[PDB]
Write a protein that binds this ligand. Structure first.
Ligand SMILES: NC(=O)C1=CN([C@@H]2O[C@H](COP(=O)(O)OP(=O)(O)OC[C@H]3O[C@@H](n4cnc5c(N)ncnc54)[C@H](OP(=O)(O)O)[C@@H]3O)[C@@H](O)[C@H]2O)C=CC1
Ligand SMILES: NC(=O)C1=CN([C@@H]2O[C@H](COP(=O)(O)OP(=O)(O)OC[C@H]3O[C@@H](n4cnc5c(N)ncnc54)[C@H](OP(=O)(O)O)[C@@H]3O)[C@@H](O)[C@H]2O)C=CC1
Ligand SMILES: Nc1nc(N)c(-c2cccc(Cl)c2)c(COc2cccc(OCCCC(=O)O)c2)n1
Ligand SMILES: Nc1nc(N)c(-c2cccc(Cl)c2)c(COc2cccc(OCCCC(=O)O)c2)n1
Ligand SMILES: O=c1ccn([C@H]2C[C@H](O)[C@@H](COP(=O)(O)O)O2)c(=O)[nH]1
Ligand SMILES: O=c1ccn([C@H]2C[C@H](O)[C@@H](COP(=O)(O)O)O2)c(=O)[nH]1
Lengths: 522, 526
C-alpha cells in the first residue's frame, strides 16, 4: 500500500464545537472558522506541530528510499501538503514553511519554485517518487483531510485534542474506528487557558551486547483474561496521567492476592502504591467513566465546618455516610449510646477539635481541642519550609468512638517557589468505587488550601496502603481498562474566597469535563 | 579486532569469602573462594546453579548470522548452542549425571588425558590456541570459560575474556583455590543484580566488562541543579542498577539533580523533593546499606526502649547510645518552651504513644500502666486474630501531644499487611534526612517488621518506606558524591533468637547481623 511506501501521515488539531451529552472521538472535530483557526493561539500545539513536521532521522532514510525505489524502480527534510485555503491563512515570516518541502494542492494556482503545486492527489505520489524526503505530513484543510482519508493514503493521524469549545465552519472527517485505531496518548497539558493532549491513530490490519545481560538478570522471573484488555494491551504509549489509576487496577487484577472480606465479598489486594497528579496542568477527574462531584464537595465543606452530624449531609441528599450512621451499623460497632447519624469524632472533629472530649453531634466545641486546620494554614503562610505541615484524622484515642476509623489518615503539605503540593496517605483503597472520588476530594482540597494561602497548586500525591479491587468490580473494571481517556477537565474556584471557612457549593466549577458512559461498578 | 570480541569468550564463576571481623576491610577481592579439596567450597546453592544454567544455555538464533559474518570476516571466509570450556580438574569434580553439560558443546583443557580417556561427547584440547582454532571451525552462539582456577588465571592474563559473570556468595567457607585478583583497569563492574537468599546465604550477580519516532514526538516538551554532575562517573557508567541499595542511591541522585533549594530549621539549606516509595524484600536480605559502614547496637537499643514505652533519655545514655542526647538538653528543652521539663525527659514521644496514646504525660518516671491506648498490643492482636484487617496501624503523631514532645515524630505511622502467612510493613516518614537519618530508619523498621512477624508466627515479606519531605543537607553533598560512586555489596542477613514469643521479651543479644560486607565509614559532615 502507497501510504506505507511513501509514509503519508496527517497532523491536525481539533477543538470541540457548539450546538446528559454523550462523548466519543467525534467530540473533537473543529478545524477552522471563516478562513482561520477557531482558537486564539495555543503555543504547545504550535510547538508540537513544528517538532513533528520538522523531525528527520537521516540514519533511517536508507531503508525508506530502498522501499520507495524497489516499489518504483532504481539536507534531508519532510514534505508538508496543504490545501490552497489552508496555504492562504498562513502568515508571512513562516509562510514558506521552514526546513520543510512545501507542496500545495490547488486547481487554480500555479508558478515560485523549490515550492511545488499539484492539480490532483495522484500528482503527489508522482512528486514523492522523484524527491528525497523523510516523511510526508498532510497539514489538511477539511477538504484535503476528507479526500486523503477517503483514498486510504494515511498511515497515521497525529491528532491534538484541544479540550475547549469554539465557533467552527469546517470539521475533521469522522475517523472510522474499523479503519484506524488509537495506539498512543500523551500527557495532559494546559496551554493558553485550555487543557489538551496528543493521540496517535494508526491504519489497522484489515554494542547491543547488554541485551543478553537483560535476559540473564531476569532468570528468576490471576484468572483474569488479558485478551479481554485488548485495547489496553495494544496501546504503545500510555502517558495520559489517568493510566496511573488504570495501571494500578491492571496490576492488582494480574498480580493481586486473593483475600476474603468482612461479608465474604472477596478482594484482590496489594500493598503500597503512589500516584502523582499535576494540578498546574489539569484537574484529574477520571474520564474512563462518569463521576459526580456535588456530594464530594459538600462532604469537604462539612469536614471544614468540623461537623459530625450525618443529617446535615442526608438533608442535602449526600448519602456517602448514610450506611455508617444506621442504628444497626452503630450497634454492630458497640455504639449503643450513639444517636442515629451521630458519626462521633470523625474527620471534621479531628480537623477542628483534636483532643477534645466528644459528647454528641449537637454540642458547642468552640475553642476545644487542637484546630489542626487553622494551624496547617498558618504554618503554610508563615513557615512554608516546615516539614511539620500535617493534618491527621487518625486519633488513636477516639477510633472506637467513630462510626468507622478514617480511610484518609493524613495530609502533608510542601511549599516551594509559591507552589503547594499535598500527600494524602490512605490506609484502605477501594480502587473501583472509592479511589476515583478520593483523588477528586483531595485534589479539590489542595486547590482550596492553595488559594487561601495565595499559592498555586502543584502536585496531589496519593499514597495507597491496602489497595484492593472487589471481585464484583472486575467485569466493570475490564470494560473501563479498554476505554481511552480524554484530556482532563479544569477546576475553577471563585477567586474572591481567601478564608478556608468561606467556600460554598457555588464557589466550585468543573470545566470541559469530557467522559465515557457511567459504569455501574457492581 | 580482539580474539575475545570475535569469538565472544566470557568467564562465569561463583566466589565465596575465605578464612582468616572487628575493623575488617572489604574490597572486590573479599569474594575470591572458588573451590576446596577439588570440589566447591559450599554444599548446594541452587539459585547460583539456576543462574549458571540460564547464562551458559541461552542463545538468540536471530543474532547468529551477525556473529557468523564477523567470525568469517576475521578469518577470511564468506539448535544453536553455546560452547563451555572446563579445566580437567573442574571436569572430574562434576557429578556423572550432569556430564556432558546438557545443550552445550563441552570442551576440556588437558595435557595428561586425551580423547581415548573419555566416553562422553566432548572436545579435548591441550592448549589455549587450539580452542581459538576449534571456535573458528564450530557453529556456536557464545563461549563460556567455566573455570578451574588455573583456567581462569591463564584466560584473564591473556586478555581472552570479554566479560566476567561473577556470583558473589555472601558467606565464608574453607577454600584452597581462589579466583585471580581482577585488575580494576583491565575490567570494570557495569551491572549488579537484585539480592537473593538461597540455601541460607545471600548472593548477587555482577558483570565485569573489559575496559521510536513517536517516542521522540511525545518528548517534544522536555524542559536543574546539575551543579556537580559527572562527579558521578562510576554511578552513571553502570548499565543495570538492580541491587535494592539503588532505591536509596537513586533518590539521592534525583534530589541532587532535580531537588529544590530551601532553608530549614538549622538554616543550613537542603535540596528537597516530596513523595518517594522504596520497597525491600526482607525474605531475601536485610537492607543494611553497604556503600558506607553502619552500626546497629544503638538503633536496636532505641527500638527496645520504644517497645518498653520509655521516654527517659538517661536509659539510652547509660547504654552509651546518644541518638536522643541533643534533644534532651536544658537549652534544647527551653528552646521548645519545655521550661518545666527535666533534662533528658523527652516527653510523650514514640514509646509513650506506642503503649499509652491518649494518657496525660506527667514525667518520665511515672507508672502509666493501663493508661491510654496500648496500640502495640492491639496491632499484635489484630495481626494474630484479624489478619485481613485494613486497620492495623501504629501511629506516633498524637496531634494533642506534639508541643509536649522534645520534637514531633518523623516516623508518623506503620501499617501492616498479612497474606499467606507473611507480614509486610509500610512506614510513612514526614521528614527524611537522606544522608544521615534514612539509612538508620530503613534498618530500624526492617528489624521491627521481623520482631512483629516472629511474635505473630509469620514470616517477614516487604518493608515499604514512604518518604514525604525528602531532603539532602548541602553539607552532605560532597560525602554523598563519594558514596554514590561506590558499588553496593550483597546485603547481610538478620537472625532473631526464635525462643522470643512476645514483643516485650527481646534484648540486644537476641539479634545477629551476619555477613555484613561494606565500604568504609563516611563522615557525612565533611
Ligand atoms: N485545525 C487544523 O489542524 C487545521 C485547520 N485548518 C483550517 O481549515 C480551513 C482550511 O480548510 P478547508 O476550507 O477545507 O480548505 P482546504 O485547505 O482543504 O482547501 C481546499 C482547496 O484546496 C484545493 N484542492 C482540494 N482538493 C483538491 C484536489 N483534489 N485537487 C486539486 N486541488 C484540490 C482546492 O483549491 P482551489 O481553490 O485552488 O481549487 C480547494 O478549493 C481554514 O479555516 C484553516 O485555518 C487548516 C489546516 C489544519
Ligand atoms: N566456584 C567456581 O565458579 C568454580 C570452582 N571450581 C573448583 O576449582 C577447583 C579445580 O580448579 P583448579 O585446581 O585450578 O584446576 P582447573 O579446573 O583449572 O583445571 C586444571 C587442569 O586443566 C588442564 N589445563 C589447564 N590449562 C591448560 C592448558 N592451557 N593446556 C592444556 N591443559 C590445561 C590441566 O589438566 P591436566 O593436569 O590433566 O593437564 C590442568 O592441570 C575445584 O575445587 C573446582 O570445584 C572450578 C570452576 C569454577
Ligand atoms: N497539530 C496541528 N496540526 C495542524 N495541521 C495545524 C495547522 C492548522 C492550520 C494550518 C497549518 Cl499549516 C497547520 C496546527 C496549528 O498550527 C498552525 C496553524 C496555522 C499557521 C501556523 O503557522 C506556521 C507554522 C510555522 C512552523 O511550524 O514553524 C501554525 N496544529
Ligand atoms: N556462577 C557459576 N559459575 C561457575 N563456573 C560454576 C561452576 C562451578 C564448578 C564447576 C562448573 Cl562446570 C561450574 C558455578 C557453580 O556451578 C555449579 C554447581 C553445582 C551444579 C551446577 O550445575 C551444573 C549442571 C547444571 C547445568 O548447568 O545443567 C553448576 N557457578
Ligand atoms: O474515603 C474512603 C472511605 C472508604 N473507602 C473504602 C476502602 C474500603 O473498601 C472501605 C473501608 O473499610 P475498612 O478498611 O475500614 O474495613 O471503604 C475508600 O476507598 N475511601
Ligand atoms: O528518625 C529520624 C529522626 C530525624 N530525622 C531527620 C529528618 C530531619 O532532617 C530532622 C527533623 O526534621 P524536622 O522536625 O525539622 O522536620 O531529623 C530522620 O530522618 N529520621
Amino acid at each position: 500500500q502507497v501510504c506505507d511506501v511513501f509514509d503519508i501521515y496527517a497532523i491536525c488539531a481539533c477543538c470541540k464545537v457548539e450546538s446528559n451529552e454523550v462523548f466519543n472521538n467525534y467530540t473533537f472535530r473543529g478545524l477552522g472558522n471563516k478562513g482561520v483557526l477557531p482558537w486564539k493561539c495555543i503555543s504547545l500545539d504550535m510547538k508540537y506541530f513544528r517538532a513533528v513536521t520538522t523531525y528527520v532521522n537521516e540514519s533511517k532514510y536508507e531503508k525508506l528510499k530502498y522501499k520507495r525505489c524497489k516499489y518504483l524502480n532504481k539536507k534531508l527534510q519532510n514534505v508538508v501538503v496543504m490545501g490552497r485555503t489552508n496555504w492562504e491563512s498562513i502568515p508571512k515570516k513562516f509562510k514558506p514553511l521552514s526546513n520543510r518541502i512545501n507542496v500545495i494542492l490547488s486547481r487554480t494556482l500555479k508558478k515560485d519554485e523549490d515550492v511545488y503545486i499539484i492539480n490532483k492527489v495522484e500528482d503527489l505520489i508522482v512528486l514523492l517518487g522523484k524527491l528525497n524526503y523523510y516523511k510526508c505530513f498532510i497539514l489538511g484543510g477539511s477538504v484535503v483531510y476528507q479526500e486523503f482519508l477517503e483514498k486510504k493514503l494515511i498511515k497515521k493521524i497525529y491528532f491534538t485534542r484541544i479540550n475547549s469549545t469554539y465557533e467552527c465552519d469546517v470539521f475533521f472527517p469522522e475517523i472510522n474506528e474499523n479503519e484506524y485505531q488509537i495506539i498512543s496518548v500523551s500527557d495532559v497539558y494546559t496551554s493558553n487557558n485550555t487543557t489538551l493532549d496528543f493521540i496517535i491513530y494508526k491504519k489497522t490490519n484489515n554494542d547491543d551486547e547488554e541485551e543478553d545481560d537483560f535476559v540473564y538478570f531476569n532468570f528468576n522471573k490471576n484468572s483474569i483474561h488479558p485478551n479481554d484488555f485488548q485495547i489496553y494491551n495494544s496501546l504503545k504509549y500510555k502517558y495520559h496521567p489517568e493510566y496511573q489509576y488504570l495501571n494500578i487496577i491492571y496490576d492488582i487484577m494480574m498480580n493481586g492476592n486473593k483475600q476474603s472480606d468482612r461479608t465474604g465479598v472477596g478482594v484482590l489486594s496489594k500493598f503500597g502504591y503512589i500516584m502523582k497528579f499535576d494540578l498546574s496542568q489539569y484537574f484529574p477527574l477520571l474520564t474512563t467513566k462518569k463521576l459526580f462531584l456535588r456530594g464530594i464537595i459538600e462532604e469537604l465543606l462539612w469536614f471544614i465546618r468540623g461537623e459530625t452530624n450525618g443529617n446535615t449531609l442526608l438533608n442535602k441528599n449526600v448519602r456517602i455516610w448514610e450506611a455508617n450512621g444506621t442504628r444497626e451499623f452503630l450497634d454492630n460497632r458497640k455504639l449503643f449510646h450513639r444517636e442515629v447519624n451521630d458519626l462521633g469524632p470523625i474527620y471534621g472533629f479531628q480537623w477542628r477539635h483534636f483532643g477534645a472530649e466528644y459528647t454528641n453531634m449537637y454540642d458547642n466545641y468552640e475553642n476545644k481541642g487542637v484546630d489542626q486546620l487553622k494551624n496547617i494554614i498558618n504554618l503554610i503562610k508563615n513557615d512554608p519550609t516546615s516539614r511539620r505541615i500535617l493534618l491527621c484524622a487518625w486519633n488513636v484515642k477516639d477510633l472506637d468512638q467513630m462510626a468507622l476509623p478514617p480511610c484518609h489518615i493524613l495530609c502533608q503539605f510542601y511549599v516551594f517557589d509559591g507552589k503547594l503540593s499535598c500527600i494524602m496517605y490512605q490506609r484502605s483503597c477501594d480502587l473501583g468505587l472509592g479511589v476515583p472520588f478520593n483523588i477528586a476530594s483531595y485534589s479539590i482540597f489542595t486547590h482550596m488550601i492553595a488559594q487561601v494561602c495565595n499559592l498555586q497548586p502543584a502536585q496531589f500525591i496519593h499514597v495507597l496502603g491496602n489497595a484492593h479491587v472487589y471481585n464484583n468490580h472486575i467485569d466493570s473494571l475490564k470494560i473501563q481498562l479498554n476505554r481511552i481517556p480524554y484530556p482532563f477537565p479544569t477546576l475553577k474556584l471563585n477567586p474572591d474566597i481567601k478564608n478556608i471557612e468561606d467556600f460554598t457549593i457555588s464557589d466550585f466549577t468543573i470545566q470541559n469535563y469530557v467522559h465515557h458512559e457511567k459504569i455501574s461498578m457492581d
